CSV table of C-alpha atoms and ligand atoms in Angstrom, one decimal:
chain,number,residue,atom,x,y,z
Y,1,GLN,CA,12.5,1.4,-12.2
Y,2,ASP,CA,10.6,1.3,-9.8
Y,3,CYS,CA,6.9,2.9,-11.5
Y,4,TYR,CA,3.9,1.0,-12.0
Y,5,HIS,CA,1.5,-0.2,-15.2
Y,6,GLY,CA,-2.3,1.4,-15.3
Y,7,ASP,CA,-3.4,0.2,-12.2
Y,8,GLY,CA,-0.4,-0.6,-10.5
Y,9,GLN,CA,-2.0,-4.7,-8.9
Y,10,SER,CA,1.3,-5.8,-10.9
Y,11,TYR,CA,3.8,-3.8,-8.8
Y,12,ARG,CA,6.2,-5.7,-6.5
Y,13,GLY,CA,8.6,-2.9,-5.8
Y,14,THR,CA,10.1,-1.7,-2.2
Y,15,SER,CA,8.7,1.6,-2.5
Y,16,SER,CA,7.0,1.9,1.1
Y,17,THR,CA,6.7,6.0,0.9
Y,18,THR,CA,3.6,7.5,0.6
Y,19,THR,CA,3.1,10.4,-1.9
Y,20,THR,CA,3.0,12.9,1.1
Y,21,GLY,CA,6.6,11.4,2.1
Y,22,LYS,CA,5.7,9.6,4.5
Y,23,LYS,CA,6.7,5.8,6.3
Y,24,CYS,CA,3.7,3.3,5.1
Y,25,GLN,CA,2.3,1.0,7.8
Y,26,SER,CA,3.1,-2.6,7.6
Y,27,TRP,CA,0.5,-4.5,6.0
Y,28,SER,CA,0.1,-7.0,9.1
Y,29,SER,CA,0.8,-4.2,11.8
Y,30,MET,CA,-2.3,-3.3,13.1
Y,31,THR,CA,-0.8,-0.2,14.6
Y,32,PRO,CA,-1.4,2.4,13.8
Y,33,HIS,CA,-4.2,1.7,11.9
Y,34,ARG,CA,-5.9,-1.6,12.4
Y,35,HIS,CA,-7.6,-3.2,8.9
Y,36,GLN,CA,-8.5,-5.8,6.9
Y,37,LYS,CA,-5.6,-6.1,4.5
Y,38,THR,CA,-3.6,-9.0,5.5
Y,39,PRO,CA,-2.2,-11.8,3.2
Y,40,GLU,CA,-4.7,-13.9,5.3
Y,41,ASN,CA,-7.4,-12.2,3.5
Y,42,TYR,CA,-5.3,-11.5,0.4
Y,43,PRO,CA,-3.2,-14.2,-0.5
Y,44,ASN,CA,-2.4,-13.0,-4.2
Y,45,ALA,CA,-1.7,-9.0,-3.2
Y,46,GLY,CA,1.8,-9.4,-1.9
Y,47,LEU,CA,1.2,-8.1,1.2
Y,48,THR,CA,4.7,-7.8,2.5
Y,49,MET,CA,6.8,-5.7,4.8
Y,50,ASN,CA,5.4,-2.3,4.3
Y,51,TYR,CA,5.6,-1.8,0.5
Y,52,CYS,CA,2.8,0.1,-1.5
Y,53,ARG,CA,0.7,-2.4,-3.0
Y,54,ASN,CA,-3.3,-2.6,-4.6
Y,55,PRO,CA,-5.4,-5.5,-3.1
Y,56,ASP,CA,-8.1,-3.7,-3.8
Y,57,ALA,CA,-8.4,-2.8,-7.6
Y,58,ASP,CA,-8.0,1.0,-6.6
Y,59,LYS,CA,-6.5,3.1,-9.4
Y,60,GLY,CA,-2.9,2.5,-8.0
Y,61,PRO,CA,-0.9,1.4,-5.3
Y,62,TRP,CA,-0.8,2.7,-2.3
Y,63,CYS,CA,-0.4,2.2,2.1
Y,64,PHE,CA,-1.9,2.4,5.6
Y,65,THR,CA,0.0,5.5,6.8
Y,66,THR,CA,2.4,5.3,10.3
Y,67,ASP,CA,0.4,8.3,11.1
Y,68,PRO,CA,-2.4,7.9,13.5
Y,69,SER,CA,-4.1,10.9,12.0
Y,70,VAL,CA,-3.6,9.6,8.4
Y,71,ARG,CA,-5.4,6.2,7.6
Y,72,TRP,CA,-4.1,5.7,4.4
Y,73,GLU,CA,-2.6,7.4,0.9
Y,74,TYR,CA,-1.6,6.7,-2.5
Y,75,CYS,CA,2.6,6.2,-2.8
Y,76,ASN,CA,4.8,8.2,-4.4
Y,77,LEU,CA,5.1,5.6,-7.2
Y,78,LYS,CA,5.2,6.6,-11.2
Y,79,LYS,CA,3.1,5.3,-14.2
Y,80,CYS,CA,6.7,4.6,-15.8
M,1,ACA,N1,-8.0,1.6,-1.5
M,1,ACA,C1,-7.6,3.0,-0.8
M,1,ACA,C2,-8.2,3.1,0.2
M,1,ACA,C3,-7.8,2.1,1.4
M,1,ACA,C4,-8.5,2.0,2.4
M,1,ACA,C5,-8.3,1.0,3.6
M,1,ACA,C6,-9.2,0.4,4.0
M,1,ACA,O1,-9.6,0.7,5.4
M,1,ACA,O2,-9.2,-1.0,4.2
């Protein structure tokens, strides 16, 4: 099962697609979106490849988007 539990900071699945069906930008890529959500900045977060994560304590997993126009979105993951 690829779901999450409550806030999903726990998650470590390899779901890398947006809520709207967009590819997730890779965490360390500063293209298209430059940001500070790097493993250098969050060594415990699991800010690997381009999978949905929660380095910020948000309500659920998300990622930056490869759509230059859409900086970030929630992930297409379910609460389990
Ligand atoms: N936690 C949801 C919003 C992500 C904001 C990304 C930021 O620009 O650092």
